[PDB]
Amino acid sequence: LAKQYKNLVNGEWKLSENEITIYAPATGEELGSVPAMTQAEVDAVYASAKKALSDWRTLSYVERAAYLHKAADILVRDAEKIGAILSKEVAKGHKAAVSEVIRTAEIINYAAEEGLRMEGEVLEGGSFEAASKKKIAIVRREPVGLVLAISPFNYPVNLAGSKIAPALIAGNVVALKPPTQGSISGLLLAEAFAEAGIPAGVFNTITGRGSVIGDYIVEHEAVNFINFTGSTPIGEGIGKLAGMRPIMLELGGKDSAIVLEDADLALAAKNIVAGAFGYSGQRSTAVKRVLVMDKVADQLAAEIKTLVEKLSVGMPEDDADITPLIDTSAADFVEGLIKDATDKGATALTAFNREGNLISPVLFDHVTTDMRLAWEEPFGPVLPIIRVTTVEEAIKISNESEYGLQASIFTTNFPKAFGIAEQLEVGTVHLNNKTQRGTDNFPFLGAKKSGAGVQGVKYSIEAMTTVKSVVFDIQ
Amino acid sequence: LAKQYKNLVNGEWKLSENEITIYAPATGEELGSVPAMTQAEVDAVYASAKKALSDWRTLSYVERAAYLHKAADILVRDAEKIGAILSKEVAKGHKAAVSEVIRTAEIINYAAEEGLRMEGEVLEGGSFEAASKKKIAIVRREPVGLVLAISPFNYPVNLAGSKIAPALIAGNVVALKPPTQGSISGLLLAEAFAEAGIPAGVFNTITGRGSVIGDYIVEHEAVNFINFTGSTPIGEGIGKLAGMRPIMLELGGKDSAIVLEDADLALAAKNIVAGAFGYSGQRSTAVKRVLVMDKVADQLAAEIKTLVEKLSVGMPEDDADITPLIDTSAADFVEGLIKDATDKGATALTAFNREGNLISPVLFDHVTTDMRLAWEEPFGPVLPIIRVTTVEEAIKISNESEYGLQASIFTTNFPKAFGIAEQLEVGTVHLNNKTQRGTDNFPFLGAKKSGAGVQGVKYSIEAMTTVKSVVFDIQ
Amino acid sequence: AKQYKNLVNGEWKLSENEITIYAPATGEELGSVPAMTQAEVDAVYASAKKALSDWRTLSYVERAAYLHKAADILVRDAEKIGAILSKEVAKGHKAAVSEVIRTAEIINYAAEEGLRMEGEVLEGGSFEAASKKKIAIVRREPVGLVLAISPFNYPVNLAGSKIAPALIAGNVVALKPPTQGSISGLLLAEAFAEAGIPAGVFNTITGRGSVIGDYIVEHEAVNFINFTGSTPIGEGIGKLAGMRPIMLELGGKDSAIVLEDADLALAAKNIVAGAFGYSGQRSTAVKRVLVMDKVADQLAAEIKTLVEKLSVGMPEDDADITPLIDTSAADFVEGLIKDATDKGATALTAFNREGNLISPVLFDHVTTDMRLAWEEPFGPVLPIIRVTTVEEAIKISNESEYGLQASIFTTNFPKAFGIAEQLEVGTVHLNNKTQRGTDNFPFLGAKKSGAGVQGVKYSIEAMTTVKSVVFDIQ
Amino acid sequence: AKQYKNLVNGEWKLSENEITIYAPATGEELGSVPAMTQAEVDAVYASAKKALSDWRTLSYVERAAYLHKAADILVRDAEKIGAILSKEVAKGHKAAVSEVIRTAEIINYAAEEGLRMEGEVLEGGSFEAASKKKIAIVRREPVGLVLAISPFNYPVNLAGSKIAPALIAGNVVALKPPTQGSISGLLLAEAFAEAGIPAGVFNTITGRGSVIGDYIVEHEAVNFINFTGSTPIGEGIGKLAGMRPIMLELGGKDSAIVLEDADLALAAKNIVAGAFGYSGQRSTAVKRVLVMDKVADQLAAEIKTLVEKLSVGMPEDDADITPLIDTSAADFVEGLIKDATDKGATALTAFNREGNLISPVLFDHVTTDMRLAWEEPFGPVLPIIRVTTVEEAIKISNESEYGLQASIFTTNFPKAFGIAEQLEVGTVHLNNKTQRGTDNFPFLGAKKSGAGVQGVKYSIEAMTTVKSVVFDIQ
């Protein structure tokens, strides 16, 4: 059942002398092994990418788009095969895992068509000074070079493809470093690009141990761009190693849901629960604190409680709403946040149970700012409700977070909601709906500790391109 | 003078307990002093700016633009007065220094009108998935926050204003840190903005000693964006301190002038000498090596020699072509490159002479790429001619540089020149003209060790803004 | 009272015949304007086409500088120009001065918008691999000579809204003001002349429609017609246009849809301000209220009270309601009012006419059988039409041959957006009156309300074309 | 014998009477198409306007999916369709199949271009401080019912170039092919039908010009007219359009300017390929060589050699030069040749005519008194006109009433760019023949050559309008 996997290096599939065995978090089942690359093997990956860059960047846009469409078609063909393993590898619900692969194909196809019709511009010297009226600048787009793409355990295929396809269509070459927990899924994605015929070296994979290659892959001079999704502390560390090279960071969140007195409380509760407890709360973009006006807090809390009690809690193969968390340390961290809130007097509206690393969904009311749960990102199924007296207080508490990814506002007064949104230190505000990354053409960005750079398809392509200006005088 | 200059801090002018005396590099004349700020005084600058940000970013674009236009009008009025002091401070020709101030006013006016008409976008959910066809995203621009602007000694007013005005029109607040040599000119620029009535704390200045505040100003958590122009080693140091903050870097160059067999050799010589020896070669964008096809090399070299022999060598007040270099270490470094070239057998077509830090312009022919002068950026008045026998060889030698700012191609075959330009690892290619940053609406950027980010006016405004997306569902 | 002259090739020209202009509110003689012959029109157009080559070869910054100087002069002389504008078209004095100030704002904005226009570079490899080395360099060019035709109700604002966008792009311009409104147009032209505009780059034409009306439009020197005025006149220009591009800003019958959850005091304030500005002589203006039954009685009472507060009198006293532009216009409005009365509409405010000064008339219980439900009055009369469902409101709104703008008053903004998608109009204002501003926003109408998109950047693009230069990289 | 039918409201429909179509090169009977009455046109338009509401409220994703499906089907059937197209308009068999393949490329590209078009959010504070809380949300909308009128010389390519851009934006479409070319248009329609296009969203009309010609255009259901064809027919559509927006792709007389430093072998190759493609029956095609005296003798000789190698024969044999579309077309070309000869032009290749198959004629020493210097032949005849200066070449080029494209052959690119600025044309090609492609590039013509800008993204923009929703942030 369990298979030995290999890295894609310069069109070939390569083992290493050592490997890493990967086990299913929900069951402990052995899923397979991936190579534990050395620094010398990382050198070979990067050497082949740089050699392939010249012939890749001089292909036409339409030729590069064709490879991407073919790889998307293969992902769709094999989505049940790949999704089944992804489900086991990161304890994601089976149907949700298959949906991840299908969404990745949609992003790949969309990026191919977005990127191929990008344009340059022509600028007039006479816009700025009369003496230069016959001088014009022809400005065309060019790739940045080699892109290091680092995907996360919670979206090991979706947030690999969100990086690979925008980079490739622009004419960049790519090396994908998946997280160890999620490396099998990353290599299954690689297989699709290889079968699609991506030229040798244009796309490669790297797997290995942090203690062996963790810093080495980022500090290497061959890398021209670093594109990372993961934890905030790891993201900060990457910034210290970037030097002059551009970087994109998609890190943590503590998204607020602001609920005003005129809100539809039943609809707010439905959206809040869907957003907060998806994939057991192991998502950066997700409602992680409710800031609710006193007058409606009792009723909102009862509506939320009713739905939380109905969530299914169990195994990935059963498509449970709440599945086991990624590992024991992660579950320990969440249990600690829950104990701090209990010990400081918060009202537990649903009960805490832990079976292995399967934590039941916990809803707290009367949370206050002295509780860790008011501020820290749990990455687990626990939601605090914080009561406020004015909208001004909700804005202040919201913005006091070190995080600034997204926010939700629930109200029937949209002109007022827009005014609140202007004051919120976040990337995106959703009105009468949960926070979410989609649709993937929309911008996706975070402020403060939540990241750097703007993604969403067209924004990610622009981030991973530069310009080349040719200037001449008309006669 | 005994003229004690002062920093602009929250609408007030402040001395510090200690000061730094500034002397003219060409003559030793005492020009005055600037404050030697403490770390706590930097704290106050940044606290003032973050306080001012809330009310500044909520003004209308038209209101912000009005302040910039008024500041530009004052700079034009005081161009002779300011340029007279700038000339002394950095040993730039008097007329050239006045021209710098006039050009700064042009950039400020253009940035105000470019920024105030920036637009947002509305994106359709149904471009990506049918189920989201009623979901739209209203995407509007917002400032990034506090911009740290660091100006260079060779354009202490032009490449201060190039940062300040684009930052301010977008709703950012700014702190300007000038180099010590160039701090008087920076504070003179600040006077114009204060007299225009810029609100207290929206624009401030910092001056002091690197050993006291150098890293502190960059690492401070109040700073949200770093915009730097200066030397490559200093720029690399700033990259190591940026962390997650976006940065722009404008560093050194070693621009090649590629001269083909069909070129207008007299025109090539005129452009080459103008670009290479302006401000004594102390410019990042400047022809720094001639790569010439051997069949026309003898004729080109004689044309260049004739012009170099005629360049005037002397004092800034007399508008000499070649003025004294910025300090003794700079001249020593240039002397060492010349000595290496001479010792390795290059042909000195004009004679090296040095009086104080005034080096006469040196033209070398038959330079080979084992010579330091073929690669290292002198920031002084010395130019090598390197002979090649194919355009492919010229392209390889050009791209072998660690620098990638601009290049010139001299030829009558423009379709061929466009094909060469595609292969050159640079930001901008000029056909039958010297390299140059203008016109200032055109993009200005460098590849490799030449920097990061895209300037030119509209590009610099884009770089110092982010977006805020508000998403809702139509019913 | 002065004898006015046309600007022609940098000089001020009299004609053999002239037309005396009188103030509509008083009968005061204001002056005369030339009555140009067809041969004089030929001379204007000849000067323009001769001036075009040098004008289009100037840099953008050079053309922008002329526009900024003209705007500065208009600001300087706003009181002087506004005082005569107010008399010429019976517009309140202060509103007339504000028109001139707004026109300067538009001229300056068009100068700076137009000078940073950019082109595109397109890649053959976006479409086919074999063409990857072929690129298209696409740059904007002027269209040529623009004929700008201004309206009586904004004789300076909606002259400058055409002239400045045209000029920054490198077009040359001939302005034909309406006879009633020609003095104000010629006062605007004085500022462009004093600003130093090269001879022939900007010219004016005045005269009688029966002599030069059709002639000026079908003349083949004209490459673009940009017209604001009545729907029937506009429709006549579309046929004489041939293949030449045209922009039309014609009539409106803007609906104000008021739902059950609306702030009725806010709706009433905006409806009255929009409907009765300049005595209702505006294409963009609330011209029919479509209100849900449940809130109709309360809304009507509130609107009535605000209508009764409007002042009714002379332009020099800054009256809200001033005399209409001419007797025929007042006669037409009186006939619409009488039709509504004879068909059973409730006159919430009463009809009173002194000369051509009509008091503001508010009707309730207006039905689709009445002319006032549909025809544009260009006078101070407003109907209220009760509806039973939002669907009925949308149907009645779209049944109009006009489709300029609409207002929606409601606290449910997602629902308001869904309604706006269904309304056959250019612009929908949420919880506000309809309006053209701000002038950077698009301004357009559907159906009989016109053609083309204005607002500053849109107008500049409309009066430019593109030139593509294609070559293969080697 | 095959009785073709129109696509109307999702059904295939005959009419009472039909029109028999014959192959121009051979006389073969190809089938019949319906001769619709005016009442039948009413029914087509009624079905389309009924379908519009449900079609424009689909997602972009869903409309794009139908277009991709139709393109896939055209590729599948490209041989079958191309074989009939070849016979219907006497186009080389291989060239006809290639037309179908290119049409699928355009349909796919339009689907993906149109689905990611965006709107704008404008700030009131850009224009005035007091409006800084007011924003405009500006989204694109379809114009409604688009009438597409395709030409005989590209009866599939320049049908789909209209249909696909219109449909992705949310318009409904009626296609009126020309009678000669109607079978090919109906074969294209089959692919859209099999793709599942909803009933009434896409429809076809066939009939005689005398019965329905003006009727289909004047009909008030039509909101947009997108026409390709002869200049005299296009000028007639401009009148009937009223206020409605139109696009016209009409005739051309493209100049090839050859300077003293040109690569004459390259110039001759491109000139002959462009001038004689499809026997010269193309609006975009070199139709006059303007060559500097000192290289004219050698250029003419190198052009002559290439013309003499062109094959002259039948469409099914992929001949370079095929019989012209009908007898009147050939008669008109013969008259131009006779006029040039009688006025002293030199026949470097000789006139011969068999039926409507005219051998390719190259004339040197053509002067401006000859009709062939100016009139569009739509046949295989090319004049060479000698000039003494580049200034003279520019003047003669711009004296034409046509202004579609131009070629400049020279090794001095900066000078060629400056010349291109002075040429009154849409597109200038450097060191290459004139051409419409690649299809993402703009395609437009000045003066009598048409109105509007096509190429894929430009054609989507042309067939949309905007809807602005404005509100105040609190």
Side-chain angles (χ1 to χ4, degrees), chain A residues 374-390:
Chain A
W375 309 103
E376 306 190 23
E377 185 181 44
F379 246 62
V382 59
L383 179 67
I385 295 174
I386 299 171
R387 286 143 184 263
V388 300
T389 304
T390 67

mmCIF file of all heavy atoms in Angstrom, chain A residues 374-390:
data_model
loop_
_atom_site.group_PDB
_atom_site.id
_atom_site.type_symbol
_atom_site.label_atom_id
_atom_site.label_comp_id
_atom_site.label_asym_id
_atom_site.label_seq_id
_atom_site.Cartn_x
_atom_site.Cartn_y
_atom_site.Cartn_z
ATOM 1 N N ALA A 374 -8.299 35.573 23.327
ATOM 2 C CA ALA A 374 -8.713 36.793 22.653
ATOM 3 C C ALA A 374 -7.761 37.181 21.527
ATOM 4 O O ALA A 374 -8.186 37.868 20.593
ATOM 5 C CB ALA A 374 -8.819 37.945 23.650
ATOM 6 N N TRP A 375 -6.495 36.754 21.583
ATOM 7 C CA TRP A 375 -5.465 37.256 20.679
ATOM 8 C C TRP A 375 -4.724 36.179 19.901
ATOM 9 O O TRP A 375 -4.438 36.373 18.718
ATOM 10 C CB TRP A 375 -4.443 38.101 21.471
ATOM 11 C CG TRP A 375 -5.109 39.152 22.323
ATOM 12 C CD1 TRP A 375 -5.318 39.115 23.677
ATOM 13 C CD2 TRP A 375 -5.682 40.381 21.863
ATOM 14 N NE1 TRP A 375 -5.982 40.249 24.083
ATOM 15 C CE2 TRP A 375 -6.216 41.042 22.990
ATOM 16 C CE3 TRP A 375 -5.797 40.987 20.606
ATOM 17 C CZ2 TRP A 375 -6.854 42.280 22.896
ATOM 18 C CZ3 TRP A 375 -6.431 42.218 20.516
ATOM 19 C CH2 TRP A 375 -6.950 42.850 21.654
ATOM 20 N N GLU A 376 -4.401 35.041 20.508
ATOM 21 C CA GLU A 376 -3.522 34.077 19.857
ATOM 22 C C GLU A 376 -4.282 33.233 18.839
ATOM 23 O O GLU A 376 -5.422 32.819 19.072
ATOM 24 C CB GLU A 376 -2.843 33.184 20.901
ATOM 25 C CG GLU A 376 -2.115 33.985 21.985
ATOM 26 C CD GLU A 376 -1.231 33.138 22.891
ATOM 27 O OE1 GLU A 376 -0.812 32.041 22.470
ATOM 28 O OE2 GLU A 376 -0.957 33.576 24.030
ATOM 29 N N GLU A 377 -3.639 32.998 17.701
ATOM 30 C CA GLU A 377 -4.181 32.143 16.655
ATOM 31 C C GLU A 377 -4.120 30.689 17.102
ATOM 32 O O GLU A 377 -3.014 30.157 17.271
ATOM 33 C CB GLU A 377 -3.405 32.316 15.351
ATOM 34 C CG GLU A 377 -4.030 31.534 14.201
ATOM 35 C CD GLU A 377 -3.278 31.657 12.892
ATOM 36 O OE1 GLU A 377 -2.035 31.576 12.914
ATOM 37 O OE2 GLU A 377 -3.930 31.829 11.836
ATOM 38 N N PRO A 378 -5.253 30.012 17.307
ATOM 39 C CA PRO A 378 -5.193 28.642 17.833
ATOM 40 C C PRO A 378 -4.801 27.601 16.800
ATOM 41 O O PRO A 378 -4.111 26.628 17.116
ATOM 42 C CB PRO A 378 -6.626 28.383 18.330
ATOM 43 C CG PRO A 378 -7.284 29.721 18.393
ATOM 44 C CD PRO A 378 -6.630 30.536 17.306
ATOM 45 N N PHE A 379 -5.248 27.791 15.560
ATOM 46 C CA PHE A 379 -5.231 26.726 14.558
ATOM 47 C C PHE A 379 -5.884 25.460 15.124
ATOM 48 O O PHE A 379 -5.324 24.362 15.111
ATOM 49 C CB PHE A 379 -3.812 26.469 14.055
ATOM 50 C CG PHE A 379 -3.615 26.830 12.602
ATOM 51 C CD1 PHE A 379 -3.775 28.140 12.167
ATOM 52 C CD2 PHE A 379 -3.279 25.858 11.670
ATOM 53 C CE1 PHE A 379 -3.603 28.471 10.828
ATOM 54 C CE2 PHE A 379 -3.105 26.183 10.330
ATOM 55 C CZ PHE A 379 -3.265 27.491 9.911
ATOM 56 N N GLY A 380 -7.103 25.636 15.619
ATOM 57 C CA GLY A 380 -7.877 24.561 16.185
ATOM 58 C C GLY A 380 -9.309 25.013 16.366
ATOM 59 O O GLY A 380 -9.645 26.179 16.141
ATOM 60 N N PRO A 381 -10.179 24.101 16.777
ATOM 61 C CA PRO A 381 -11.636 24.378 16.746
ATOM 62 C C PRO A 381 -12.169 25.021 18.025
ATOM 63 O O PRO A 381 -12.960 24.442 18.784
ATOM 64 C CB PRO A 381 -12.222 22.984 16.498
ATOM 65 C CG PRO A 381 -11.255 22.055 17.204
ATOM 66 C CD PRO A 381 -9.878 22.687 17.072
ATOM 67 N N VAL A 382 -11.761 26.266 18.260
ATOM 68 C CA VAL A 382 -12.166 27.016 19.443
ATOM 69 C C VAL A 382 -12.436 28.461 19.044
ATOM 70 O O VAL A 382 -11.588 29.104 18.415
ATOM 71 C CB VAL A 382 -11.098 26.953 20.554
ATOM 72 C CG1 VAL A 382 -9.770 27.523 20.059
ATOM 73 C CG2 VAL A 382 -11.593 27.687 21.795
ATOM 74 N N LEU A 383 -13.606 28.975 19.424
ATOM 75 C CA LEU A 383 -14.053 30.301 19.009
ATOM 76 C C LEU A 383 -14.465 31.142 20.210
ATOM 77 O O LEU A 383 -15.387 30.741 20.958
ATOM 78 C CB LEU A 383 -15.217 30.182 18.019
ATOM 79 C CG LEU A 383 -15.814 31.495 17.514
ATOM 80 C CD1 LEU A 383 -14.828 32.251 16.645
ATOM 81 C CD2 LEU A 383 -17.114 31.239 16.750
ATOM 82 N N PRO A 384 -13.849 32.307 20.421
ATOM 83 C CA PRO A 384 -14.302 33.206 21.489
ATOM 84 C C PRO A 384 -15.311 34.247 21.018
ATOM 85 O O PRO A 384 -15.250 34.751 19.894
ATOM 86 C CB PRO A 384 -12.995 33.880 21.929
ATOM 87 C CG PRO A 384 -12.242 34.029 20.622
ATOM 88 C CD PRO A 384 -12.587 32.783 19.809
ATOM 89 N N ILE A 385 -16.248 34.568 21.911
ATOM 90 C CA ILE A 385 -17.207 35.653 21.729
ATOM 91 C C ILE A 385 -16.829 36.760 22.708
ATOM 92 O O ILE A 385 -16.746 36.522 23.920
ATOM 93 C CB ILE A 385 -18.654 35.193 21.966
ATOM 94 C CG1 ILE A 385 -19.069 34.171 20.907
ATOM 95 C CG2 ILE A 385 -19.594 36.403 21.977
ATOM 96 C CD1 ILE A 385 -20.423 33.550 21.148
ATOM 97 N N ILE A 386 -16.632 37.972 22.187
ATOM 98 C CA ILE A 386 -16.217 39.138 22.967
ATOM 99 C C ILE A 386 -17.298 40.205 22.831
ATOM 100 O O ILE A 386 -17.628 40.621 21.715
ATOM 101 C CB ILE A 386 -14.853 39.673 22.495
ATOM 102 C CG1 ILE A 386 -13.775 38.596 22.658
ATOM 103 C CG2 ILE A 386 -14.471 40.937 23.251
ATOM 104 C CD1 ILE A 386 -12.440 38.948 22.033
ATOM 105 N N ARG A 387 -17.847 40.647 23.961
ATOM 106 C CA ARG A 387 -18.922 41.631 23.959
ATOM 107 C C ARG A 387 -18.359 43.044 24.013
ATOM 108 O O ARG A 387 -17.450 43.335 24.792
ATOM 109 C CB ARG A 387 -19.862 41.394 25.143
ATOM 110 C CG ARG A 387 -20.762 40.187 24.949
ATOM 111 C CD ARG A 387 -20.991 39.416 26.234
ATOM 112 N NE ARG A 387 -21.781 38.215 25.986
ATOM 113 C CZ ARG A 387 -23.092 38.130 26.161
ATOM 114 N NH1 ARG A 387 -23.800 39.157 26.604
ATOM 115 N NH2 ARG A 387 -23.710 36.985 25.882
ATOM 116 N N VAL A 388 -18.911 43.923 23.172
ATOM 117 C CA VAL A 388 -18.491 45.315 23.101
ATOM 118 C C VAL A 388 -19.705 46.213 23.299
ATOM 119 O O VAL A 388 -20.854 45.789 23.159
ATOM 120 C CB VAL A 388 -17.790 45.658 21.767
ATOM 121 C CG1 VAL A 388 -16.543 44.807 21.592
ATOM 122 C CG2 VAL A 388 -18.738 45.477 20.583
ATOM 123 N N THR A 389 -19.427 47.478 23.620
ATOM 124 C CA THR A 389 -20.470 48.460 23.882
ATOM 125 C C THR A 389 -20.691 49.436 22.732
ATOM 126 O O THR A 389 -21.803 49.955 22.591
ATOM 127 C CB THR A 389 -20.141 49.250 25.156
ATOM 128 O OG1 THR A 389 -19.955 48.345 26.253
ATOM 129 C CG2 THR A 389 -21.267 50.209 25.494
ATOM 130 N N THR A 390 -19.678 49.687 21.899
ATOM 131 C CA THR A 390 -19.806 50.598 20.768
ATOM 132 C C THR A 390 -19.067 50.035 19.560
ATOM 133 O O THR A 390 -18.172 49.196 19.693
ATOM 134 C CB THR A 390 -19.237 51.987 21.090
ATOM 135 O OG1 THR A 390 -17.815 51.884 21.260
ATOM 136 C CG2 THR A 390 -19.852 52.546 22.355
#
